[PDB]
């Protein structure tokens, strides 16, 4: 769009004023050559009220400048020129509508602008000396960053009672600002990148107690390695415990957008209409299995239907001998447990860290009854 | 009322003593013209015990003043005059019975009062010099705020062993107070305005993981925009997960007070007695639907009765053609699913971010059986 | 007992050594008159190993003293005399087996002892001057508390390269200790008195959102006043949500100890055996009702039996007229709903913030069937 | 393995460069005798790219050294020699793949290396003086640790405008680093050893409220002593509330590995196949009972089967007289409640803090029906 360029340009204009207006307060030698750059900035700043898509904007937009330094408006009553900086609140509020920027750019940039302003103010109540403005500005900012950040050298100290009063309030405000921002950043880096901080402690607690006990090396592996698979394939995250709070039509939408891998590639899941993909993809619950891991033994009960998405798993006999075959992508098994109401003849292991989807049984038999075509689709692969 | 004026006036009196009594300790030149303002303050402070609707009040109310400085009661035994400031505990406790004031006014104001008192105390053990009291007070407060806030210039340093002992304990206590208050405020601004801090992180976690995955732009919208609707219409808040802990008669009262919009404007909900509004307004569960969002397809099961409060939704045929009509405020639909025990003929979308109330079915059929009049009221709109 | 006196006396002995041994290192003028007080302390410290009801105790108990300063054991090899202070670990561990003391006395006392020790150490590598030991000790502790607490005056600075090396490590260690303890206390006062901090925020969140909405003044009261009743009678606390984690025999024991008020004062609950008081006092669930609050209307269903412990409640007719009677302490009602299987004729309000116990119905009818005597006890008051 | 030695040697090489390269920048007198030790380090650093099991490694591996100081490559363009230290990111990332090291060695070691580097840099923009390099290095590091750790002596101050500019940015960066690391460590020690910190507060809350009430001394004991048994035998930990998040095959594996004590030592649990130990060891729920604690009275209902692992419990009559016998390790009781469908004749107490396993009943009767052999194994001990 084009309006973001307008926001960044008005931001630049407000920074221009925040750097220049205190300098013009201290140095009346300015504002004489800058009048074109001042009138353009003033017209830009006054041409912003009606763009809604208001007190600070109205207070800053009144043309108090071009008069403060022209009519020369003596110093005790010229301190009302600072009301032009109240656009800081508006721009900080709008900076959210554009932890990297909430408490980072709104804090260190504010600290720098405030430091510049207060160094210029501390420059103002000094006796008129004979030194270059640049080196005096560096010295003033040096003293300012010394007392604002709580260092305390003391090579520059107040001498007049009015400067001693000013240094009381600047000491208080600066050590408040320093402590505030530093404590905020310290409490925020303990929240920054909250995925590695929360998840790694999730691993720490479990690991800690299982290593308080003693566990075999071939079970020490696959524990830290299941956390590694959940750290690399899933990046420290289970899914369902975080997706309850998202609404029911929103679990429908997010789940049909995300679980696009399992559906419309196996002949069961392609061409299966639409009331499935809303009804069952929320019930589509994934699990992860490691290498050489058993699920069923010979003839157990409650053997739900196993939908393999990717990965190859061998099927063998009840014993280790007489290799049957390989089952791989694009197919499924596990179905003649409930449709045939019969005990089972199957043995399963896994080659590697395989992903397999495990859905419940009562909803399965509830929904297959409402659909002759796809229960028949199950049925030919059941019978042949 | 009038008693709050009495609390603020006694607060002013205690501040008056906290500022003045150390000054009279250091400067015996006072207390001579202030005797009217001292007797009125003393009578006001002693006329507060019986107003219950007690150790600090009794200890402060004893007339030790008007004698400490009259009989002149030499300095080592005059330090018991400080027992009059123990009303600080009482006023700080009562300040709750009147995070903007719990750890803000009880901390910075306490810091300022303590700073004044300890600067006056540090003034006390100085050699008698020849300087104005005002500039010496500013210098003493300057050194105090220098060492209390941990800056460390060093232009003013102790010289006598007794002053070196006093500066040990004031250094310890001041750096304790500084660290305490600054760490408290730093940990409190991470709790201050806890709605934007908690909710924005609620958005952050979800957004973070859904953007760790990749989601379509027309589904990137309505996610952040559902959070925007929950941030502007609801201000970052779901309702039921926070209202369990409120008691059952209190969910009755709060819910009948709050959900006054849905009831007594549709002819179902007006004139419907009272045992409804207690029985069902807790079961009145709201949901939000975005533009162009489906709910039902053609003839599904379990189509509960839809109560639309505000907003207009179109009804069309099973296909996109042959526009039926507009359904809008003041009415309802969704009813012939359970009363007629029949499949459905309806298609629904939404124009915008519409609010719709979704209540359960088993309680509905439980309560409609106990009420002939209002099930009949449902029935004419069902039949005609 | 007597052994706690022994622990406090050995604690005093360890403090005696921690204060005195560095002084004897710096000042060899000591240890000459203190030999009785040294031999008694040594015999007390060596007579502590066998009292189990061990490395630091054994390392401290070896008689290296009485030889370090007698044979004079030149200074570079005399630094092993500090191994006697390792009883600090043992006493800090035992201080739990005796937030007011876990991170308070183990931190500020440790800071003070460490400060004393390191000030004496900084005294050790100084050129031999001619000043009183007291004022030099105050000056050394002054510099120490200046650099340990990060103040930085600079009136005392290192001059020799070895003192510059020592001040590097003491600066590092002292600013580590200062930051550690101050951040710990700042994070602990945000946990200190965790009942007012957790509960008041519990009130804050609810109050905040109900005042984000608008609620009537006669419902603004009884909300904050129900929190006041839960803050004064219960002190910010519900009961059952915290007593699940306590085990089942332990809910039996704690509940029969605590709920001694409701039982054995009404004729139902006295003389009722024992298998009740274990079976039902966990199911004894309390609720609180405010003034003038309705529960039932005329003839509703599911009117469980109401056990009033204390407080008087009026019973009136279905309308406001024809006052029936007062029901008060020592009795109960609510019973002919389930035993007679009949609709109800009752109206109830409450005079004030009354406490009433509400138990479930299925367990009630399960247990009354196993007990003829007490269901009969219910029965006469039901029938007469 | 051998590759960890390679990582520690390359770590030593990177530390060698981080200490030496700034010194060679400041002191061109080096690099002349070190050429063998420089060529070996360079060949080691360039022989690390292909060992995957990449921008910093490639940028550091380019042979910019051996030319920077040979061709003498004048000072303003020689600052690109610092790009060799970017292996810090790689080694800090790999330090996790090898709270004692996450935010401890990555922070204090980084602080020390940064301090050395910035002290050498501050040495660089000094006028050429005539002092030994060692004492000047100590003085520079002294000033650096003074301003980096926010102490502020002031014996060494900048004089040139360029040094004043450098001290502005080093003051800012150093007080940022100091505050960051110290606040991080302060917030981490409140998380460090999170077992004693979390559990002791678990004890604190309960103890606090039960001591807000008043509880008998023989019930004050066994409360703190049940927490002591859970603190010494279990180390502040219940089991099931933390093992839900571990997956179902993983509760199978972890539970069969951990609960190896109860199984295969009583004749019930040995030789019982395998589908038990997966089916019931997750349902194997442990409880702890203290001395002299009742469970059943005479003839109650729902007396599940009691599996005693270790400890001896007496059985007596319904009254205190006529001692029956001792029941001890290797056996079980509690079985004729459900198999015989009969009321009970038993009384039980406990000698000490005994561990007993309590499993549910519906799964027990569900699984015993599928197993004739082991229900018969139950049956002979039931009948004889
Ligand atoms: N001849 C065969 N060789 C290998 N696998 C088979 C064979 N016949 C059937 N199967 C699969 O083995 C599975 C075991 O029973 P299921 O119900 O899981 O579904 C079964 C089929 O998918
Ligand atoms: N002729 C019509 N045109 C538009 N809407 C209708 C018409 N007749 C009924 N409806 C509504 O359409 C809804 C679809 O079925 P419901 O049970 O939800 O309730 C129905 C009625 O409220
Ligand atoms: N004559 C009466 N006057 C006042 N209260 C009564 C009278 N008779 C019965 N009650 C009580 O009124 C209660 C209303 O029905 P309950 O089942 O709650 O138990 C009833 C009795 O305890
Ligand atoms: N003669 C006996 N002396 C002691 N204990 C017995 C005797 N006979 C049975 N028991 C045990 O007492 C227990 C009480 O009933 P249970 O069903 O718990 O299982 C019973 C047996 O294990």
Residue numbers in the entry:
A (entry chain A), B (entry chain D), C (entry chain C), D (entry chain B): 10 to 62, 81 to 125, 132 to 417
Give passages from the manuscript.
In contrast to WT SthK and SthK Y26F, but in agreement with the higher open probability of SthK R120A, we also captured three open state conformations for SthK R120A. The C-linker/CNBD domains of these three states are all in the activated state, with the C-helix in contact with cAMP, the entire C-linker/CNBD assembly translated towards the membrane, rotated by about 12° with respect to the transmembrane region, and expanded radially with respect to the pore axis. The gradual increase of the pore radius from O1 to O2 to O3 is due to different endpoints of the S6 helix transitioning towards the final open state, O3, which suggests that O1 and O2 are on-pathway gating intermediates towards a fully open channel. In all three open conformations of SthK R120A, the lower two helical turns of the S4 helix of the VSD are displaced outwards by a small kink at Val118, allowing S5 to move, which creates space for the expansion of S6.
Here, we used SthK, a cyclic nucleotide-modulated channel from Spirochaeta thermophila, to define a ligand-gating trajectory that includes multiple on-pathway intermediates. cAMP is a poor partial agonist for SthK and depolarization increases SthK activity. CNG channels are tetrameric channels where each subunit consists of a voltage sensing domain (VSD, S1–S4), a pore domain (S5-S6), and a cytosolic cyclic nucleotide binding domain (CNBD) that is linked to the pore domain via a C-linker comprised of four α helices. Meanwhile, membrane depolarization increases cAMP-induced channel activity, suggesting that voltage modulates the agonist status of cAMP in SthK, similar to its action on other CNG channels, although the mechanism is not known. Cryo-EM structures of VSD mutants with increased activity yielded cAMP-bound closed states (identical to apo and cAMP-bound WT SthK), as well as four additional states: one gating intermediate and 3 open states with different degrees of opening.
